[PDB]
Amino acid sequence: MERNKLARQIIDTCLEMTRLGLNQGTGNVSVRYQDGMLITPTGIPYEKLTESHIVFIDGNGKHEEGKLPSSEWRFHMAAYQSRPDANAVVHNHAVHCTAVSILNRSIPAIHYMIAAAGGNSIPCAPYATFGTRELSEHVALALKNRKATLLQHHGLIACEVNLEKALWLAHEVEVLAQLYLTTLAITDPVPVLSDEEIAVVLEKF
Amino acid sequence: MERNKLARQIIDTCLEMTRLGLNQGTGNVSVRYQDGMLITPTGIPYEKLTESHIVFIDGNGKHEEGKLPSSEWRFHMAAYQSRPDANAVVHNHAVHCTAVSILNRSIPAIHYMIAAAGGNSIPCAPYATFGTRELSEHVALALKNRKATLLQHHGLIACEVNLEKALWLAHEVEVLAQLYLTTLAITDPVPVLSDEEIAVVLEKF
Amino acid sequence: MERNKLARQIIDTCLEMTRLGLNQGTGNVSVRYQDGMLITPTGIPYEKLTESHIVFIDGNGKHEEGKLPSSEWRFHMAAYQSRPDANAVVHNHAVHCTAVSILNRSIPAIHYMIAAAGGNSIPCAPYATFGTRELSEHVALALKNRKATLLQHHGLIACEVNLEKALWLAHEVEVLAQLYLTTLAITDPVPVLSDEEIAVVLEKF
Amino acid sequence: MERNKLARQIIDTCLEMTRLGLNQGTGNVSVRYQDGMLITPTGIPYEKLTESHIVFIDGNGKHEEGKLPSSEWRFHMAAYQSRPDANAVVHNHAVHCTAVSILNRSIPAIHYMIAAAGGNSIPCAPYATFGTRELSEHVALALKNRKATLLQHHGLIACEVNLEKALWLAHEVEVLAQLYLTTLAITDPVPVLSDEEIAVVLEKF
Ligand SMILES: [Zn+2]
Ligand SMILES: [Zn+2]
Ligand SMILES: [Zn+2]
Ligand SMILES: [Zn+2]
């Protein structure tokens, strides 16, 4: 659990994300570490990334000297304080999720895998300018009882116990997003599973 | 026809499936073997899979010691008992097929390749919680006269004589799914080939 | 211009086609040769293809001994007799083109690249069972004044002077297909360029 | 900043563009150089491109002897004269952008990344035959206060300080295009961010 092993995984998650069709050189990834977090830097294209580029931001919000952390670092810190169990955070502007956040809609229970994020929906937190404390509060309120949330006019945040499951979850919500937009263009509303049905699935997971 | 050759093929089918855009670390593949089947395990990402991870489940539903078979193993066993000719089963949550299963619609004869699954349609079996005996019965009734079926709010099952044709068929039904949703957004109903026309194509295959 | 050099190119065109997202192990490719043509065989997956699998079919429709030519060989021969200038033929079931052939619509002049196929449209020939003489006649009538045509409920045929341009053209018509279906879901009709405008573009090419 | 280093980058941008899903052997790339520019040649498929194929066109519009510059070179020269700060130009026929240019619509502020191109929109310049002086004037007027523009019934032009950012920007506008068409099929108008909101984002960048 050294710093470089964690930094290598961050980078591999970036590469993997790009390969899955979710990143477009616009996302950012972090892990919980010591009293704060390790995050991707702003400005460096993912493919030029080396272990030594990863940035440490302490619990007070102070970042390592001579390194610029991602421009969206503040809602990574908000996630870690709102959800003590989260150890990794994945943010991207995946097209389908983002398109659903532009309609300012929550993703309802159109598929039983919606339970991976913890309930019968994927919420859409309200718009606030990237990098602000106001955006950070909306994110913290949306992650109180869900592991993933849309961000109106912006994209997605997913958190989990490690980077593997956070990427897995991020991908699953982009599939759910795609399903909802594809079915919504044909019929409105979209048929959903009942709350009873989701409660069984939750128990089963 | 040793166990490892069959296990290697299962793994290659997983890899291939992921490369074709159908799997997203959510499907499961099996082959008929001895008195039961060889299936993919639950919990291991496809890329960490080795021959020794594949799980044997006998005809009584008893799985090898210290191995966890996929969570969806019961409808693989239902397929093998409903269709004696099936020797391999491919299940995934391919986006277009799944989107059609959310509208709870059958895929009708919009293209002459619908005959690869054995008739003039791809049915949609009703919803039941994953991993249950009730889901297993719906699957068994849907595969009685077709080689592939949608599963409402869930995804797809395809079966054939070997893994090569089962993957081939699974991919073909995802193309058919895509065609139907793309045309359905423009016009409802979608023009179909007549039953007479499908009967000629069937004979020809 | 030996037989093996031509057979190697056929195979590379198959591989390339699959890489571009047009083939799904359902198309077939040919080249004009001697008094007939060299075509891909039926039944062999593209990746197992070797120079020695390619099939020669003479001008009388007689194929080499102990080799099965593609099941769709007859409209390849129809193309060569209807268009003396065509030296290669590419057929596939590319999703967007096929979706447009299911609406039984011609692709009109929504983009100036429609002139690559020779006019102000990409026609849609009427349905007839694959592999028949009736299908062959519709194809021959559609290619009289165009280098590419849709085939209702089926897919696409493109022909050109060599395999490079036939694949290039096939890809361009799949892009045109995608543009038309994407715009058609928003507005019906789709704005087009006037015949005057297409006549200038034609002259320019 | 030798000529070959610049020629190598042009080629890599072509390759990269094709890998991102934007090019289809139809775009063209240039860099500002000496008194004119270095551009891709017409007729050579991107994968056969070598440093020695790149063409130099002076400020008078005279191209190197025995080399044919792209057929769309004139609006590359128009870009360089309309925007002194642009050092690289990327043009392609990316499907979503092109589909939006067929509806002859501007892309409005549906996402905060619209500010990368310099304002609250991505304009759509009017149609004129490829390769003409009339097309060149529309492009010059559209790039006066934006770094990217759609071209009605045609595709996209993006310019920036270097090739890296010009490709990055071109990709971002294709994502914006996709978002707008996907949301437009569900609801018309598409919710946008207010001008006040975009003014803050602009300041922040
Ligand atoms: Zn963001
Ligand atoms: Zn499943
Ligand atoms: Zn065909
Ligand atoms: Zn162009």
Side-chain angles (χ1 to χ4, degrees), chain C residues 50-68:
Chain C
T50 62
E51 290 65 24
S52 298
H53 284 126
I54 309 307
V55 177
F56 178 70
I57 298 168
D58 72 23
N60 290 318
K62 187 232 230 141
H63 64 81
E64 298 187 305
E65 188 219 285
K67 275 192 205 189
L68 284 305

Short mmCIF file of all heavy atoms in Angstrom, two decimals, chain C residues 50-68:
data_model
loop_
_atom_site.label_atom_id
_atom_site.label_comp_id
_atom_site.label_asym_id
_atom_site.label_seq_id
_atom_site.Cartn_x
_atom_site.Cartn_y
_atom_site.Cartn_z
N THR C 50 -7.28 -18.21 -45.39
CA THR C 50 -5.97 -18.22 -46.02
C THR C 50 -6.20 -18.13 -47.53
O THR C 50 -7.27 -18.53 -48.00
CB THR C 50 -5.09 -19.45 -45.78
OG1 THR C 50 -5.74 -20.62 -46.30
CG2 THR C 50 -4.73 -19.58 -44.30
N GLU C 51 -5.20 -17.72 -48.28
CA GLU C 51 -5.24 -17.53 -49.73
C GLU C 51 -5.91 -18.67 -50.47
O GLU C 51 -6.68 -18.49 -51.41
CB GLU C 51 -3.84 -17.37 -50.32
CG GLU C 51 -3.10 -16.09 -50.01
CD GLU C 51 -2.77 -15.92 -48.53
OE1 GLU C 51 -2.68 -16.92 -47.79
OE2 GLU C 51 -2.60 -14.76 -48.08
N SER C 52 -5.68 -19.88 -50.00
CA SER C 52 -6.19 -21.12 -50.54
C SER C 52 -7.66 -21.40 -50.28
O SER C 52 -8.25 -22.32 -50.84
CB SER C 52 -5.22 -22.22 -50.04
OG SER C 52 -3.93 -21.92 -50.61
N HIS C 53 -8.32 -20.59 -49.46
CA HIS C 53 -9.75 -20.68 -49.23
C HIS C 53 -10.56 -19.91 -50.27
O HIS C 53 -11.71 -20.25 -50.52
CB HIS C 53 -10.03 -20.08 -47.86
CG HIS C 53 -9.61 -21.03 -46.78
ND1 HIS C 53 -8.76 -20.65 -45.77
CD2 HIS C 53 -9.95 -22.32 -46.56
CE1 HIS C 53 -8.59 -21.69 -44.96
NE2 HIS C 53 -9.30 -22.70 -45.42
N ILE C 54 -10.02 -18.84 -50.82
CA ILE C 54 -10.70 -18.01 -51.81
C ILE C 54 -11.15 -18.87 -52.97
O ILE C 54 -10.48 -19.81 -53.41
CB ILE C 54 -9.79 -16.86 -52.26
CG1 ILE C 54 -9.23 -16.10 -51.06
CG2 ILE C 54 -10.52 -15.88 -53.19
CD1 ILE C 54 -10.22 -15.57 -50.03
N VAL C 55 -12.35 -18.62 -53.45
CA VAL C 55 -12.98 -19.41 -54.49
C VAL C 55 -13.11 -18.70 -55.83
O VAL C 55 -13.46 -17.55 -55.96
CB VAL C 55 -14.38 -19.86 -53.99
CG1 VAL C 55 -15.10 -20.63 -55.09
CG2 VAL C 55 -14.28 -20.62 -52.68
N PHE C 56 -12.80 -19.46 -56.89
CA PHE C 56 -12.92 -19.00 -58.25
C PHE C 56 -14.23 -19.55 -58.82
O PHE C 56 -14.59 -20.73 -58.71
CB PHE C 56 -11.70 -19.44 -59.08
CG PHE C 56 -11.92 -18.98 -60.49
CD1 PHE C 56 -11.86 -17.62 -60.80
CD2 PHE C 56 -12.24 -19.90 -61.48
CE1 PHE C 56 -12.12 -17.21 -62.10
CE2 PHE C 56 -12.47 -19.47 -62.78
CZ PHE C 56 -12.43 -18.12 -63.10
N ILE C 57 -15.02 -18.64 -59.36
CA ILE C 57 -16.31 -18.92 -60.01
C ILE C 57 -16.16 -18.34 -61.42
O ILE C 57 -15.72 -17.18 -61.56
CB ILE C 57 -17.53 -18.28 -59.33
CG1 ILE C 57 -17.65 -18.83 -57.90
CG2 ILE C 57 -18.81 -18.48 -60.14
CD1 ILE C 57 -18.60 -18.12 -57.00
N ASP C 58 -16.33 -19.19 -62.42
CA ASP C 58 -16.14 -18.78 -63.81
C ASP C 58 -17.31 -17.95 -64.30
O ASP C 58 -18.32 -17.82 -63.59
CB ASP C 58 -15.82 -19.99 -64.69
CG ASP C 58 -16.89 -20.98 -65.01
OD1 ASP C 58 -18.11 -20.75 -64.98
OD2 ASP C 58 -16.53 -22.14 -65.32
N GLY C 59 -17.30 -17.47 -65.54
CA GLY C 59 -18.40 -16.71 -66.10
C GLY C 59 -19.68 -17.49 -66.30
O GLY C 59 -20.75 -16.89 -66.46
N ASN C 60 -19.66 -18.82 -66.27
CA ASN C 60 -20.86 -19.62 -66.40
C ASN C 60 -21.50 -19.89 -65.04
O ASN C 60 -22.55 -20.54 -64.96
CB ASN C 60 -20.48 -20.92 -67.11
CG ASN C 60 -20.12 -20.69 -68.57
OD1 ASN C 60 -20.80 -19.92 -69.24
ND2 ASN C 60 -19.09 -21.34 -69.08
N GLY C 61 -20.85 -19.48 -63.96
CA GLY C 61 -21.36 -19.72 -62.63
C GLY C 61 -20.85 -21.03 -62.01
O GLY C 61 -21.40 -21.44 -60.99
N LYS C 62 -19.85 -21.67 -62.60
CA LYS C 62 -19.27 -22.91 -62.12
C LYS C 62 -18.12 -22.63 -61.14
O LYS C 62 -17.14 -21.99 -61.49
CB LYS C 62 -18.76 -23.80 -63.23
CG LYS C 62 -18.28 -25.19 -62.79
CD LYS C 62 -16.87 -25.46 -63.32
CE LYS C 62 -16.80 -26.82 -64.00
NZ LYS C 62 -15.94 -26.78 -65.21
N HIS C 63 -18.23 -23.15 -59.92
CA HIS C 63 -17.14 -22.86 -58.97
C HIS C 63 -16.12 -23.97 -58.85
O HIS C 63 -16.37 -25.14 -59.18
CB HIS C 63 -17.78 -22.46 -57.66
CG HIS C 63 -18.58 -23.55 -57.00
ND1 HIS C 63 -17.95 -24.54 -56.27
CD2 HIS C 63 -19.90 -23.79 -56.95
CE1 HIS C 63 -18.88 -25.37 -55.80
NE2 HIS C 63 -20.07 -24.94 -56.20
N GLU C 64 -14.90 -23.61 -58.44
CA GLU C 64 -13.85 -24.60 -58.27
C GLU C 64 -14.35 -25.82 -57.49
O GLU C 64 -15.12 -25.72 -56.53
CB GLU C 64 -12.70 -24.06 -57.41
CG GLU C 64 -11.99 -22.86 -57.99
CD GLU C 64 -10.78 -22.49 -57.16
OE1 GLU C 64 -10.90 -22.29 -55.94
OE2 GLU C 64 -9.68 -22.42 -57.76
N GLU C 65 -13.80 -26.96 -57.83
CA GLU C 65 -14.09 -28.21 -57.15
C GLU C 65 -13.79 -28.26 -55.67
O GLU C 65 -12.71 -27.89 -55.22
CB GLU C 65 -13.16 -29.19 -57.88
CG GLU C 65 -13.42 -30.64 -57.48
CD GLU C 65 -12.05 -31.31 -57.38
OE1 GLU C 65 -11.46 -31.60 -58.46
OE2 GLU C 65 -11.67 -31.48 -56.20
N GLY C 66 -14.69 -28.77 -54.83
CA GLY C 66 -14.45 -28.93 -53.40
C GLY C 66 -14.29 -27.66 -52.58
O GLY C 66 -13.65 -27.68 -51.53
N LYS C 67 -14.85 -26.56 -53.03
CA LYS C 67 -14.83 -25.28 -52.33
C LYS C 67 -16.24 -24.71 -52.34
O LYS C 67 -16.90 -24.89 -53.39
CB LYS C 67 -13.88 -24.33 -53.07
CG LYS C 67 -12.44 -24.48 -52.66
CD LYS C 67 -11.57 -23.35 -53.18
CE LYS C 67 -10.13 -23.81 -53.30
NZ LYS C 67 -9.27 -22.63 -53.61
N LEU C 68 -16.78 -24.14 -51.29
CA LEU C 68 -18.15 -23.60 -51.38
C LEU C 68 -18.00 -22.08 -51.40
O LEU C 68 -17.43 -21.54 -50.45
CB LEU C 68 -19.02 -24.04 -50.22
CG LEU C 68 -19.60 -25.44 -50.13
CD1 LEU C 68 -20.43 -25.86 -51.33
CD2 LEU C 68 -18.48 -26.44 -49.87
#
